[PDB]
Amino acid sequence: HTVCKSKGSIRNESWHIDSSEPLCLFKKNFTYNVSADWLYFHFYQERGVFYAYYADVGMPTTFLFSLYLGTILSHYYVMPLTCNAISSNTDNETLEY
Amino acid sequence: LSGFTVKPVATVYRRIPNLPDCDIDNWLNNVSVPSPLNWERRIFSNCNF
Amino acid sequence: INSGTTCSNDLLYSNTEISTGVCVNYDLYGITGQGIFKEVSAAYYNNWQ
Numbered sequence: 001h002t003v004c005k006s007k008g009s010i011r012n013e014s015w016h017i018d019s020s021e022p023l024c025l026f027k028k029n030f031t032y033n034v035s036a037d038w039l040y041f042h043f044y045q046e047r048g049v050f051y052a053y054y055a056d057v058g059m060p061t062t063f064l065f066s067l068y069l070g071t072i073l074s075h076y077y078v079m080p081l082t083c084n085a086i087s088s089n090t091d092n093e094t095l096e097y
Numbered sequence: 098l099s100g101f102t103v104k105p106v107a108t109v110y111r112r113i114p115n116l117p118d119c120d121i122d123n124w125l126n127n128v129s130v131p132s133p134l135n136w137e138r139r140i141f142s143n144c145n146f
Numbered sequence: 147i148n149s150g151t152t153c154s155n156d157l158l159y160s161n162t163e164i165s166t167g168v169c170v171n172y173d174l175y176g177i178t179g180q181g182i183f184k185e186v187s188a189a190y191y192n193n194w195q
């Protein structure tokens with residue numbers, strides 16, 4: 001699960017537990033417009049390499065990276081957003097993925 | 098006839114590093130020097146140096 | 147040793163200067179070939195290109 005920064009719940013974000021930093025193949029931060037409206041993302045694997053594309057504004061989609069893993073991923077999921085300002089009594093706002 | 102097709106020896110290699118730097122010099126040049134009794138340790142992983 | 151991800155950078159990619167004018171082998175950005183380099187001033191490139 002994952003919690004929200006602003007108007008957080010009475011819980012804490014805890015989805016993984018590690019006593020040491022594991023070995024990773026890619027780690028880099030990205031920035032986008034805070035005043036955007038709709039975001040688009042593309043993901044696909046082929047010939048053993050995986051791709052990622054992101055877009056914050058406009059019709060096309062920009063490039064992120066091209067990773068080599070040698071395996072074939074099969075599953076994908078979207079963690080829920082536990083918060084308190086996504087209710088009817090709060091401001092009118094819902095979550096769509 | 099075929100002329101002289103000798104191939105050069107130089108080679109140019111440019112590629113995205115894909116990983117951030119370790120910044121070991123930034124940690125070794127800190128303004129605060131730890132005492133020999135504390136000897137604060139540092140761990141570096143998933144980075145290039 | 148010889149494992150993990152924290153590899154070195156001065157092994158073979160010493161970031162040589164662009165020796166424009168002569169024919170040289172290109173092995174950069176995952177593309178092999180040969181050619182001559184020239185110097186221009188372009189502005190159509192983007193951050194992800």
Ligand SMILES: *[C@@H]1O[C@H](CO)[C@@H](O)[C@H](O)[C@H]1NC(C)=O
Nearest residue numbers: 026027028029030116117118
């Ligand atoms: C990415 O942002 C997080 C949160 O601010 C930070 O802890 C991390 O060091 C950043 N990573 C890079 C590569 O800037």
